[PDB]
Design a binder for this molecule. Structure first.
Ligand SMILES: [Zn+2]
Ligand SMILES: [Zn+2]
Ligand SMILES: [Zn+2]
Ligand SMILES: [Zn+2]
Ligand SMILES: [Zn+2]
Length: 71
């Protein structure tokens, strides 16, 4: 299972994840990739604001889904 996260500049991060990963887990991986602090990261999928303590499965984020970092 992998997902893509686009940064505010449009740069693509590719992450290996599992359905039960939380959004907090994904923020931790983005921080390793790009040095973006988790408290600075806001993620959206399909127009939904994603909360740290919910999982990819809870938002119906599937393989090959793209999340966006936003302001
Ligand atoms: Zn896979
Ligand atoms: Zn596992
Ligand atoms: Zn995980
Ligand atoms: Zn901070
Ligand atoms: Zn998009």
């Amino acid at each position: 299972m992998q997902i893509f996260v686009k940064t505010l500049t449009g740069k693509t991060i590719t992450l290996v994840v599992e359905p039960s990963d939380t959004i907090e887990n994904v923020k931790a991986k983005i921080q390793d990739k790009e040095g973006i602090p988790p408290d600075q990261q806001r993620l959206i999928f399909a127009g939904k604001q994603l909360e740290d303590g919910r999982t990819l499965s809870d938002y119906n984020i599937q393989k090959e889904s793209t999340l966006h970092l936003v302001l």
